[PDB]
Amino acid sequence: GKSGTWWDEHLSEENVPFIKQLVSDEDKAQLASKLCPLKDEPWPIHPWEPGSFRVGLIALKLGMMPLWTKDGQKHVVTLLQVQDCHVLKYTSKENCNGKMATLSVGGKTVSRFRKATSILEFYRELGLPPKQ
Amino acid sequence: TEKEFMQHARKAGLVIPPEKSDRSIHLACTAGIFDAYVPPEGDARISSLSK
Amino acid sequence: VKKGFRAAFRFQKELERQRLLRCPPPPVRRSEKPNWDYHAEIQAFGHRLQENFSLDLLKTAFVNSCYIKSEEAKRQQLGIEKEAVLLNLKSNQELSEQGTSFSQTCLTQFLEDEYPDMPTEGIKNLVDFLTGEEVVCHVARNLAVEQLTLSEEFPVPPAVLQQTFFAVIGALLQSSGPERTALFIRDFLITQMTGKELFEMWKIINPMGLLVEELKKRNVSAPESRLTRQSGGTTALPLYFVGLYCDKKLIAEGPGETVLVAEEEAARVALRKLYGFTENRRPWNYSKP
Amino acid sequence: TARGTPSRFLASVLHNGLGRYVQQLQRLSFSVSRDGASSRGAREFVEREVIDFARRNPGVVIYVNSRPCCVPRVVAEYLNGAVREESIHCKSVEEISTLVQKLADQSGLDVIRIRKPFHTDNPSIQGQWHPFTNKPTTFRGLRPREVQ
Amino acid sequence: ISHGRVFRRMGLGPESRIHLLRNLLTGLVRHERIEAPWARVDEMRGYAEKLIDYGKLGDTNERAMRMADFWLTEKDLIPKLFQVLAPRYKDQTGGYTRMLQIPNRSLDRAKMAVIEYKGNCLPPLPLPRRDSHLTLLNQLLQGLRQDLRQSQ
Amino acid sequence: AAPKNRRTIEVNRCRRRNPQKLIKVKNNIDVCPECGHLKQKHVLCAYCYEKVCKETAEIRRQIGKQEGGPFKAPTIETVVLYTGETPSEQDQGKRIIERDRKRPSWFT
Amino acid sequence: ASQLSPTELTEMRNDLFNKEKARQLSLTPRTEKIEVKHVGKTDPGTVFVMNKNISTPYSCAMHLSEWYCRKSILALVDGQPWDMYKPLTKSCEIKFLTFKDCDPGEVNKAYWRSCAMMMGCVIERAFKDEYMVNLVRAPEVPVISGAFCYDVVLDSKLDEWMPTKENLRSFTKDAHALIYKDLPFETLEVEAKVALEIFQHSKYKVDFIEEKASQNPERIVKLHRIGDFIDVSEGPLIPRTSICFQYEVSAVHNLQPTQPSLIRRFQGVSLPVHLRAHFTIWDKLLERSRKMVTEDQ
Amino acid sequence: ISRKWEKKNKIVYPPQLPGEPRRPAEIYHCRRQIKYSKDKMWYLAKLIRGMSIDQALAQLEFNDKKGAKIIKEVLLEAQDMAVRDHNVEFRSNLYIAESTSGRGQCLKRIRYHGRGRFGIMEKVYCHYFVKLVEGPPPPPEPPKTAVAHAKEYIQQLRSRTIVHTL
Ligand SMILES: [Zn+2]
């Protein structure tokens, strides 16, 4: 019988802030490493065709606000913030259903200490923080 | 709807015959030794015939 | 209470039966049970197989050495002299030797004259199976020689049972003709081969090598194995039929779940055909000349 | 009921009919009473027909105990270790004779459901059927929709 | 639906809840250490924080005086609050009322907590110590830290 | 509404013997580093808490003896002392409560 | 020194080890009693009446409770760390040391010695038979460094190669297979002459035994075994080989200029079951353990 | 009333021949007439059923049920008597083989329903039976693998005969 455990159970009083600091720095460095997609090795950029569809994104609902138009009408709007949105993986047309290609996109960054190990390995290979 | 438990038992012997009786318990043995036989300290060394 | 005795007796018998079922006693010898007369049992034994045994020879065949040692140990530990018959009990050692030897030679002659194209090794292994511990013990227990046997360890260890069985065979050999005892060993040992395959008594290891050397002896070049049939190869339940061809001529075939086991079965079939021990062979002729 | 009772296959004891037939009945033990109305058929059976039965088949050992009993009995013991006990309580002499002849006729195998009243050890002579019997072969063993 | 609803329903109404919390807080001020069911102790801890803040607001403050007068029902702990408890936490800002979980109440198996004002001349509670820095994992992490410092 | 039929022992066993109704095994239990009396993680040790509570009860009884009656609550800090253990220079204005004991080797 | 197959070498080594163990068990004629006191903190005053050179501190823990058996990693026989399966000799006082004690340095050293011994056992039996693989020694590196090490000399034909990531993972897989089977770390204290006669082949092991028996006036060197592997080590070891939960080999490095031949240093990091770290922290430790550690002076 | 669990410790075995398995010790203990429901006791017994003595005591110490402390007490007396009477050297070397609850003798009381109508209340009692075997707990049976599933399916396919014919 193996008891459960969390990330900071056996860590010491001095080692807890060190681990937090180091992991946060590694996270921020990984996030900053992806700031220049067009210089690493971008995939070819195709022109837009009539019957084409592009990728969306994951946002965060901030709140609602008033807004006014030039004719004096009032419309309520919702603010959606893009916190850390990255393309995670791409499956070919024939590898999912043969109907359309798929792009997986991730949301805001979360902690690495509370994720599945397979997900952790995936994000380690991708070189990015885990997404909610 | 009116019934309880029973069998109140005690598991210790006592001295009830001397409380009131005209007959006594007939004994066959005594309590200890009238006088302990002290053995010689060097009995093992003197385990021979005689000295 | 209810007045009566019949239901109470019936329930007592039922309870006794249930107690016996729940706690069965260890089994005991038939000689230790009420209805037993040893001389009558010996005579009925001799009469039931339609043979004329010498009575004293049968008693000698049913005595055993370990029994004699136990009896003399008992007498020497009780301090009682019984040297009148113990020194003459004359155990069944020599009778067992004669019976085993004659049974071996008779079974060998029978099987040799029945399957001429058999190897000496195959015939010897067939004889070893037929005189083997399990077969002779089963025959002896079903012919009720385990009851007349005299020995300790009421289980009558299989070695002792087989020794006493062949002692009975030797006693029949001494009392009557070799032809009579040959008919006896036929009837009660050759019949044990019925419904059994050759490679269930021989227990060979390399059928392909055996077939190759047999064809080398018979001046047959070489068997090449070819896939004659198959149904399903990419599934978990395949069927393969492999045929062995000698000089472009098919000599045997065999099925299997894999090609290797199909080839091994084909080799076994070829060996059976070559040795003349097939399911279609002439059944043993039980008769009199 | 078959689903509520055991079962077995048709079989012999030691291949009885292959070589010599042997009597499977080994012993008959009779408990009969000197006095007692229930042992009268057994009494007259012992008087008349037990001697002739013993002379008729000498491979069977017959014991008669003659003890006080309310229920006379016959115990049949067979070469394969089977033991069968029967009540001859208040039975006629003809009934007892039929019973003992039936006991001598049966083998020691259990009288239960017999399951397919034939036992062949070589059911096939020309070869058991398999899905490839009665199926023709193709050139080079080519399965349907093949190329070479 | 109780989305964003603090202040659990404790007694037989809001006034009963306030009076239960007041009794618990008065006991805490008197005894410096109080054991009670876990949820009531949680609410009373939230209240004790602001009680100490009001005590730090000053003895002569009329609003703080009225708040203390309401929240202490024995009238002899108000001087304690203003001249013992508040001056004890002059330097610290909000770090008092340590709260721990004690096994369970015997009768009804209720979840039980203990709460204490820090300072507390009473004997110390068996606090849960963190793992020592000399353990194998902590030594490995310390070596990693030293190597990182050297690489810097 | 009444049951139309009696529930069988098989149905009852299936209902009352399935894993949702069984007691779960807990893996929060380890030995207390002090006193080794099998505490539970995230919960204080019962043995150590009882020890502390007994000492606190004795101290509070001494407090009540010293204070006199109700409604006292001295306006100074407090300090507990033991056999020997002369008062220190920093605890002058504090109330002193010394019952009679050797200071336990967990209260410093 | 003569020609010997490695398999037969292991069989003869095991036979000599077992013969020595049998004579050590036999020179004591009868069962003698020792009053081993418990000077620990949780169960004070407990005295065990144990058997001389038969019973172990694990047996004392069995008397106490199951938690003692599970958590106790080392013993303290009146001053000194004893491995859990070393028979007791004299009437002593005992104290059990775990991984989470206030001063776990002794158990850390013992655990790292055990991990190095397992790594050496995995290494010795994972190379081609026609190469000569020889174990030099396991340096007593401190736990504060990144990994435990084992020095190995390979045959001359392998003075130019380097193992890749797949081979490293194969070494880790062999280590985990060794972990999966519960193998006690059997101990033995022998004389110098017997110690030489068990090995008799490797001059590195011979000089190791000389160095370990010189400073002892009684000329006695410790000997430990898991399964059928026997190594010479300084200091006691952990009771079971399944105590380790996370185990890896990181890399191997060379130190050539100190000898005409080549000596390689295999490095690895492990974490016990009581002190398992998260995936990310273990990745950090794995990344650090690949660095060369030089602590021999 | 039957008291047969009590007499299972009075069985005396003949001395073993030198070359024989250890024959681990076997201790039976029980508590009669517990003021508890037998189903409620069955749940705790079922939890305790397969564990070792120390693990069972640990699990029972942090269960907030009335019968948990009763079973803990019974296990403690069983362990003490196993070490003292039945020659078990290691007090921790015991595991639970049998752990079950049984109905005890009960009483009947009147319930006074809300009219001139009523019900009969039963004052429930129960027994607890435990049996300890000396030695480590037996390993749990691992779940059967797909290999075993395929093997048994193949054996089922191979066992079939041609039915209702020769
Ligand atoms: Zn504690």
XYZ file of C-alpha atoms and ligand atoms in Angstrom, chain E residues 126, chain F residues 31-39 44-49, ligand 1:
17
model
C 1.828 19.856 18.664
C 3.194 7.137 12.993
C 3.561 10.264 15.095
C 7.267 11.243 15.110
C 6.927 11.963 18.829
C 5.181 9.399 21.066
C 4.713 7.107 18.036
C 0.970 6.732 18.635
C -0.414 6.499 15.087
C -1.700 9.946 14.210
C -3.187 16.612 15.299
C -2.035 13.558 17.225
C -4.553 12.547 19.882
C -1.846 11.551 22.371
C 0.126 14.793 22.077
C -3.039 16.897 22.092
Zn 1.874 12.011 19.063
